């Protein structure tokens, strides 16, 4: 069997929850090499399990999002916290033991719990709508944060004082405290409940990682057979105790350009020399690796098969999905001009402007500018709220993007740094992409079109929207590349490279 170790860490507190507010998701949290690889090992019929090292109270919804909830997992923190096979509960925050007489203010984003004008709490909901945490206040200042597991029990409480974060108590579903992790400058040490010391080598750890190393090495000892393979998400936060201690079985290192600094990879001789094989998502990185060490380096393009393929054949609209992030105002101007021209020539073309920027006021300014710059064309079909053919949207999650791309004909991202997930969705859906730069994702005139100047949109958009033969070449190109990934041949190539 195959043990996958992901890197789904928190940027500012490695071993903590990576969850985000439902309305404020970072663009770099989400689909990655571990998801892609576990799916294809699943498609390939391999036995595999996920080994999660950081605190993940929302893990089951997270896995459900990638059709992996059934894939099997071990969670270090689940083990620590004695969670076991807990009965799932659906927490309705309205039925908690609030102080008598609180009132609820429903905003478009959260619920305020107040008592005669005094803030008691802020209630936060997950992407799937489940209660994730409550910020609990005293004298208008946060006092503690209740963190709820998606199985519907209280997982931990983060206490505050003057001075900010103080410490975090991690609980079992009974409410019993298993351990306390301090959060102050110069003090991140961990205290185990003395009644649980039986299960631990120490009562007091210097930091949370020391305990995580201990739990991992126990997993390695008990659960990895000599004939098993560990597939490790390359990360300096855990390579040393995962790869350094790797004598038990086979090892594959996975290098993912969104996460990994190539220089850091190429410098870690000790990790690379212990790999039986290396995977990465990029051909240039693969080449540097093959240059520097004699190891099998297998290129695995990061397909996301949740995307639907080719459904735009079933609509009369020819919907363009146009990413506006990182474009300057003058680039938006030049773009609107060409979009107007192709749209007067083709009444079926519609344009959805797409902003992935989570910051509210930045997005508002981009929308405000787009509205004003369209007003000048003096035409109702070319306006932003005879009906209009322009819209502006801000997808909140990969699921939004996936839904928004279902019937899309053409992807346009013409900035110098095109959005990565959008590119992945492109090769995963067959939707052709227009870029101004070369990428590993697009072969010119095969599944996309590289324009040298923005006015070349006036050529590139008809090339895929009105000449049907070019669009089907792109769908067919994707379908075959897709199948090296669904068909199991890539997995077998990885496996037999050692």
UniProtKB/TrEMBL annotation:
This is Accessory secretory protein Asp1. InterPro entries: Accessory_SS_Asp1. It comes from the Bacteria. GO terms for biological process: protein transport.
């Amino acid at each position: 069997m195959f043990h996958f170790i992901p890197s789904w860490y928190n940027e500012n507190r490695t071993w903590y929850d990576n969850n985000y507010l439902w309305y404020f998701k970072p663009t770099n949290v989400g689909f990655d090499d571990t998801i892609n690889q576990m799916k294809m090992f699943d498609y390939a019929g391999k036995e595999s399990r996920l080994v999660v090292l950081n605190y993940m109270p929302n893990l089951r919804y997270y896995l459900h999002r990638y059709d992996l909830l059934e894939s099997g997992y071990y969670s270090v923190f689940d083990d620590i916290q004695e969670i076991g096979n807990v009965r799932q509960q659906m927490i309705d925050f309205r039925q908690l033991n609030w102080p008598e007489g609180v009132d609820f203010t429903y905003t478009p984003f959260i619920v305020l719990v107040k008592k005669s004008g005094d803030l008691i709490a802020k209630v936060q909901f997950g992407e799937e709508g489940n209660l994730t945490h409550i910020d609990y206040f005293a004298n208008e200042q946060i006092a503690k944060k209740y963190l709820f597991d998606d199985r519907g029990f209280l997982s931990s409480i983060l206490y505050y004082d003057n001075g900010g974060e103080a410490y975090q108590d991690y609980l079992a579903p009974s409410g019993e405290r298993i351990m306390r992790e301090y959060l102050r400058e110069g003090d991140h040490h961990v205290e185990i409940n003395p009644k649980k010391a039986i299960h631990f080598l120490k009562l007091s750890y210097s930091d949370i990682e020391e305990l995580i190393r201990e739990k991992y090495l126990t997993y390695l000892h008990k659960e990895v057979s000599k004939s098993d393979t560990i597939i490790v998400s390359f990360n300096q936060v855990h390579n040393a105790f995962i790869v350094g201690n790797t004598s038990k079985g086979n090892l594959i290192l996975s290098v993912f350009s969104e996460r990994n600094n190539a220089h850091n990879v190429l410098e870690d001789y000790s990790s690379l020399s212990r790999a039986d094989a290396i995977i990465c998502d990029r051909l240039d990185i693969a080449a540097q690796l093959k240059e520097k060490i004699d190891k099998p380096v297998v290129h695995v393009s990061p397909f996301d098969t949740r995307l639907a393929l080719g459904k735009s054949n079933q609509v009369r609209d020819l919907e363009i999905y146009f990413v506006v992030d990182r474009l300057s105002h003058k680039e938006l101007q030049k773009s609107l001009t060409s979009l107007y021209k192709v749209m007067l020539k083709n009444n079926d073309i519609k344009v959805t402007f797409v902003s992935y920027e989570r910051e509210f006021e930045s997005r508002q300014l981009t929308y405000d500018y787009l509205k004003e710059a369209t007003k000048v064309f003096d035409q109702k079909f070319f306006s932003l709220s005879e009906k209009t053919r322009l819209s502006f949207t801000h997808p909140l999650s990969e699921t939004d993007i996936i839904n928004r791309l279902e019937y899309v004909r053409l992807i346009i991202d013409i900035s110098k740094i095109p959005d990565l997930y959008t590119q992945i969705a492109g090769i995963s859906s067959g939707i052709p992409q227009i870029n101004t730069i070369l990428t590993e994702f697009v072969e010119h005139r095969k599944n996309g079109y590289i324009i040298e100047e923005i006015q070349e949109l006036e050529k590139a958009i008809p090339y895929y929207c009105e000449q049907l033969t070019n669009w089907n070449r792109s769908l067919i190109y994707s379908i075959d590349k897709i199948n090296d990934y669904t068909g199991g041949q890539l997995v077998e190539r990885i496996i037999n490279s050692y």
